[PDB]
Amino acid sequence: ALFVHRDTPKNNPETPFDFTPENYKRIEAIVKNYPEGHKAAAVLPVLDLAQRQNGWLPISAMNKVAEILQVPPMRVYEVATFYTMYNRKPVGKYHIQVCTTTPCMLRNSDSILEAIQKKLGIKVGETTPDKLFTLIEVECLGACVNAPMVQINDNYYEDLTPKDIEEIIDELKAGKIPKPGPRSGRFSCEPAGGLTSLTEPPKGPGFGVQAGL
Amino acid sequence: SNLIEVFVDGQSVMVEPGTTVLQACEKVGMQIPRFCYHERLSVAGNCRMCLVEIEKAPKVVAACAMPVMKGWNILTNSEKTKKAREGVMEFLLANHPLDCPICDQGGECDLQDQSMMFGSDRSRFLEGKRAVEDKNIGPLVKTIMTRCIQCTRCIRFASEIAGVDDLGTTGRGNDMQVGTYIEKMFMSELSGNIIDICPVGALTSKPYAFTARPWETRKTESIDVMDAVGSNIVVSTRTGEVMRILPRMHEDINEEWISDKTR
Amino acid sequence: PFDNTTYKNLQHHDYSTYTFLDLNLDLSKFRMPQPSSGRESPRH
Amino acid sequence: KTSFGSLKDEDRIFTNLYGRHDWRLKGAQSRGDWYKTKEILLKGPDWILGEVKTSGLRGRGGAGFPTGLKWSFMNKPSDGRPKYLVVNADEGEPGTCKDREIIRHDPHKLVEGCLVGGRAMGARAAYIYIRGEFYNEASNLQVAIREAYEAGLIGKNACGSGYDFDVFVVRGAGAYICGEETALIESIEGKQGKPRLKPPFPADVGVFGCPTTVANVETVAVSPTICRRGGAWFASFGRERNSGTKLFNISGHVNNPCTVEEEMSVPLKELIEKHAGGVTGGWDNLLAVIPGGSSTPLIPKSVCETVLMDFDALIQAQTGLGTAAVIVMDRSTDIVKAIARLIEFYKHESCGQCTPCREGVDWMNKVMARFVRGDARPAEIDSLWEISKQIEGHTICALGDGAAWPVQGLIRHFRPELEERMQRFAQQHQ
Numbered sequence: 001a002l003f004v005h006r007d008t009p010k011n012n013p014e015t016p017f018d019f020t021p022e023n024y025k026r027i028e029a030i031v032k033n034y035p036e037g038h039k040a041a042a043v044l045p046v047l048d049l050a051q052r053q054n055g056w057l058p059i060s061a062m063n064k065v066a067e068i069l070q071v072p073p074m075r076v077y078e079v080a081t082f083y084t085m086y087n088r089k090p091v092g093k094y095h096i097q098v099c100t101t102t103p104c105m106l107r108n109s110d111s112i113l114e115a116i117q118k119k120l121g122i123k124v125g126e127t128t129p130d131k132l133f134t135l136i137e138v139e140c141l142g143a144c145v146n147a148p149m150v151q152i153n154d155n156y157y158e159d160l161t162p163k164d165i166e167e168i169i170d171e172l173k174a175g176k177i178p179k180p181g182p183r184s185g186r187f188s189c190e191p192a193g194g195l196t197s198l199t200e201p202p203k204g205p206g207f208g209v210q211a212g213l
Numbered sequence: 214s215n216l217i218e219v220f221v222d223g224q225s226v227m228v229e230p231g232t233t234v235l236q237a238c239e240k241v242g243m244q245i246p247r248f249c250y251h252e253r254l255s256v257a258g259n260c261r262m263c264l265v266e267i268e269k270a271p272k273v274v275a276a277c278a279m280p281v282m283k284g285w286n287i288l289t290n291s292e293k294t295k296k297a298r299e300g301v302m303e304f305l306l307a308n309h310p311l312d313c314p315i316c317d318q319g320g321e322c323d324l325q326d327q328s329m330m331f332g333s334d335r336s337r338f339l340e341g342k343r344a345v346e347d348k349n350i351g352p353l354v355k356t357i358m359t360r361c362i363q364c365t366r367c368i369r370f371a372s373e374i375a376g377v378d379d380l381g382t383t384g385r386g387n388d389m390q391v392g393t394y395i396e397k398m399f400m401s402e403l404s405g406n407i408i409d410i411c412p413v414g415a416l417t418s419k420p421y422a423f424t425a426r427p428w429e430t431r432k433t434e435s436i437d438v439m440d441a442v443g444s445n446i447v448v449s450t451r452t453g454e455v456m457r458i459l460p461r462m463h464e465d466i467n468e469e470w471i472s473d474k475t476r
Numbered sequence: 477p478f479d480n481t482t483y484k485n486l487q488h489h490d491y492s493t494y495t496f497l498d499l500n501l502d503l504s505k506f507r508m509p510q511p512s513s514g515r516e517s518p519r520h
Numbered sequence: 521k522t523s524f525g526s527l528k529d530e531d532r533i534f535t536n537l538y539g540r541h542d543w544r545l546k547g548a549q550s551r552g553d554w555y556k557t558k559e560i561l562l563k564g565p566d567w568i569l570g571e572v573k574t575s576g577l578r579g580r581g582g583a584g585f586p587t588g589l590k591w592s593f594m595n596k597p598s599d600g601r602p603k604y605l606v607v608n609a610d611e612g613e614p615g616t617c618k619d620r621e622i623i624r625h626d627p628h629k630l631v632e633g634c635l636v637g638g639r640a641m642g643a644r645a646a647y648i649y650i651r652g653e654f655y656n657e658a659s660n661l662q663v664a665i666r667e668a669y670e671a672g673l674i675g676k677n678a679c680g681s682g683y684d685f686d687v688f689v690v691r692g693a694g695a696y697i698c699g700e701e702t703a704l705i706e707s708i709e710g711k712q713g714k715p716r717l718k719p720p721f722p723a724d725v726g727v728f729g730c731p732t733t734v735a736n737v738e739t740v741a742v743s744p745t746i747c748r749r750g751g752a753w754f755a756s757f758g759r760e761r762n763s764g765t766k767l768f769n770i771s772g773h774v775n776n777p778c779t780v781e782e783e784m785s786v787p788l789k790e791l792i793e794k795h796a797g798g799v800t801g802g803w804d805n806l807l808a809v810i811p812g813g814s815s816t817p818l819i820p821k822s823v824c825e826t827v828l829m830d831f832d833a834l835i836q837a838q839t840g841l842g843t844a845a846v847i848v849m850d851r852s853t854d855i856v857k858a859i860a861r862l863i864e865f866y867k868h869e870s871c872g873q874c875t876p877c878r879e880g881v882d883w884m885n886k887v888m889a890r891f892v893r894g895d896a897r898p899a900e901i902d903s904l905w906e907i908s909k910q911i912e913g914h915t916i917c918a919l920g921d922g923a924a925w926p927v928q929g930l931i932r933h934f935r936p937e938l939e940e941r942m943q944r945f946a947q948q949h950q
């Protein structure tokens with residue numbers, strides 16, 4: 001929750017970080033996406049790649065990203081503290097992100113937050129003592145008609161009730177992986193009482209095309 | 214030539230293309246209130262104190278960054294220009310600490326002076342203020358980041374003039390903090406000039422700290438001898454004793470900077 | 477046949493943590509050479 | 521046409537909106553995408569920009585600027601620097617979840633829109649700035665872009681027209697301010713997503729200092745359909761200067777929260793009662809509706825009875841159309857708590873660059889948090905009005921406007937609820 005750093009014995013500039021060689025080839029592919037002379041444009045994807053490899057960002061992933069892109073380390077520290085996905089503390093293995101903005105709050109995301117809390121025994125911001133779950137409270141995740149919903153490390157679990165999210169936490173404690181979708185009957189975003197549109201077969205190529213084209 | 218004509222409060226003035234609104238008002242002798250604009254740094258546009266009305270335009274423009282068009286009438290003393298200035302001064306003083314008596318910037322503060330000139334005279338702020346953790350950047354610059362008004366003259370100085378690239382903003386929103394993010398010791402040869410261009414008491418001189426106060430000092434315009442550049446300096450004395458050294462502007466030598474040995 | 481009752485986007489149930497980056501690495505060859513500003517960085 | 525709405529499936533641009541068909545290339549070609557694309561590319565930039573100007577397309581991002589007039593700012597001879605189309609796929613707006621549906625379910629339509637819109641402005645490549653939380657959607661779009669490269673549709677000699685056009689995907693990292701066009705440009709360049717001042721406009725100095733148009737997913741994805749079906753077809757829908765179809769997100773307190781495509785100038789009551797299954801508890805249970813996502817001011821049930829869901833009817837209704845993300849609120853809602861949670865969003869999603877939003881959105885969060893409990897006096901309502909008017913029109917970008925407008929809508933339509941909240945606070949805590 002702090003935006004200054006202090007060198008702890010588990011987070012210091014001599015904490016061992018290095019990319020795997022297949023991640024060096026991934027960083028080559030990332031840096032080739034941007035124009036020559038603008039290698040600093042790959043600060044966000046390579047830092048996300050370092051977080052995906054390591055689970056979180058020590059201050060050696062930031063220094064390695066500054067070392068392999070030839071940018072100042074302060075200009076990587078700015079990006080790492082600005083964006084709210086870069087975990088500068090070690091988070092749990094399943095990082096649960098409950099949305100509590102107004103379209104999810106109106107559809108009772110507080111009951112889901114309370115269900116996750118009394119299932120895990122933690123509160124907002126805490127990590128479980130076995131380092132499996134970190135429950136934080138996030139802003140709008142962009143799945144608003146599927147409210148209420150959480151995100152667990154990559155995956156959107158949508159249309160949730162307390163029973164649905166407790167079943168998800170059960171099968172995440174069981175070592176399995178759940179299916180990322182709406183936990184009600186519907187599939188992605190349609191009206192739940194059947195399709196109110198797009199029931200007819202779509203037309204295909206050549207339909208309605210103007211002349212001379 | 215290709216000089217275009219702009220009007221500043223009706224007064225006609227011929228400016229070069231690419232001239233900002235602030236420089237157009239300067240050419241008729243009106244100094245627009247600024248906090249993040251500095252004529253030797255890059256333009257930031259992020260304090261919004263220079264907001265001025267152009268007439269027949271339903272929006273104030275940031276005069277430090279806005280290039281003039283032909284035939285603009287700049288209204289530096291209009292009603293909504295003054296409302297913009299009072300609002301921005303209100304937001305700057307919303308979270309600013311009540312530290313003026315214990316502050317070395319008191320009496321020589323931009324925030325005090327153009328709060329007296331352009332701000333309102335009382336507060337509507339009824340909440341708790343933020344308080345920022347203090348940083349440590351060496352034995353020269355006393356750092357009290359609660360007074361920081363986030364104008365980024367730090368960062369533009371250390372980036373473009375000192376060439377160090379080690380100050381920056383961490384965080385986001387009202388919790389945005391200026392610093393090095395680590396326990397780093399900002400020791401340049403020009404590092405004491407961030408005390409000059411900080412408009413507030415956030416970066417003060419640690420050797421000078423608490424000893425004097427600007428209204429009681431005598432300004433003796435003198436010359437550096439610590440090298441062969443010959444930087445023009447002000448030797449401020451108080452009751453027969455030298456208190457600190459400040460630069461003089463001299464465009465051909467030291468433009469308005471001095472080194473840390475000099476300072 | 478025409479089907480409208482199944483959800484055809486079932487491929488993202490198998491995406492790993494490196495799916496995006498491996499697709500970038502696979503697309504690294506299909507692209508045009510990037511334009512250069514003439515210098516190596518704006519600090520060069 | 522005096523009555524709008526009731527849009528048929530032959531006129532829906534976004535077929536396979538619901539994921540009910542194959543999103544891949546063999547599905548997208550069988551629904552109409554990538555048809556006669558070489559003939560669109562070979563008719564030049566000016567024909568395509570004329571078909572976008574004639575169609576009356578406005579920007580779907582929330583500003584609503586005329587899209588053909590916007591894209592013709594790039595229709596200018598090169599000066600050595602490349603040109604870049606940039607697709608705004610951030611979509612951090614509360615209520616808004618439609619570009620997720622376009623990218624997740626119709627990705628080749630977005631790729632063909634990138635190709636057509638980049639040919640129209642002479643762009644070298646396309647950088648799609650997708651939301652970093654949309655990881656499955658990003659890999660979904662990446663499989664589609666690999667399918668469009670391997671079919672020769674983009675890349676070297678795109679669609680066989682002698683045009684070289686790359687399409688990139690840049691993932692964000694969790695900041696709502698990176699949906700603003702200049703801050704998105706700053707985030708592609710590898711910095712903090714902090715907006716630029718204008719001038720320079722992105723068509724002069726944009727991403728990497730090149731000429732650049734930033735455009736929404738939806739206004740890019742409809743452009744091949746506007747080219748194929750014609751501009752007059754797309755301009756036959758909605759009112760004049762409000763032309764076309766639109767994805768509407770109805771969420772909140774409705775029975776069936778949904779993404780739906782619908783004609784532009786549809787009534788809001790018809791949209792809710794036709795595609796969403798009504799307000800929970802009937803239309804008489806309606807309290808307020810935020811019409812277009814969080815940046816637009818709310819309008820109460822008396823305004824929502826006859827309002828039309830395009831730009832002009834909502835601007836005259838002292839609100840905005842925005843992203844057209846309909847948040848529906850019933851009479852069982854603490855509306856001051858909802859607007860306070862929305863202002864809490866706007867201070868946790870604000871890049872902190874300039875003074876009015878950085879200081880005043882936090883100070884509005886503090887005043888709204890006291891208004892929820894009632895720990896206030898009725899002079900502070902007008903005080904909060906003047907604070908919101910000091911933020912509006914004074915910031916660098918429009919997150920200050922978008923954080924001032926909900927406060928203004930709440931005060932303007934619900935001053936009595938604030939007053940009775942505070943006076944019952946006074947008569948039970950003193």
Ligand SMILES: Cc1cc2nc3c(=O)[nH]c(=O)nc-3n(C[C@H](O)[C@H](O)[C@H](O)COP(=O)(O)O)c2cc1C
Binds near residue numbers: 582613
């Ligand atoms: C705070 C803020 C957030 C924005 N977020 C988005 C967004 O998520 N998606 C989007 O398309 N436009 C967003 N915009 C609007 C863009 O600035 C811009 O208008 C748009 O992306 C491109 O123009 P267009 O509407 O013609 O597509 C946002 C604007 C602001 C001020």
Ligand code: SF4
Binds near residue numbers: 317
């Ligand atoms: S910096 Fe200026 S306004 Fe702030 S406490 Fe010091 S003298 Fe007062």
Ligand code: SF4
Binds near residue numbers: 361362363366367416
């Ligand atoms: S410390 Fe001073 S110069 Fe630096 S950003 Fe803050 S107010 Fe500006």
Ligand code: SF4
Binds near residue numbers: 715869874875916
């Ligand atoms: S309005 Fe808010 S989010 Fe935008 S540049 Fe200013 S402080 Fe940043």
Ligand code: FES
Binds near residue numbers: 100101105143147615
């Ligand atoms: S409000 Fe929770 S996802 Fe948008």
Ligand code: FES
Binds near residue numbers: 248257259261263
């Ligand atoms: S002086 Fe122009 S905005 Fe700071």
Ligand SMILES: [K+]
Binds near residue numbers: 318407409410412417
């Ligand atoms: K100072």
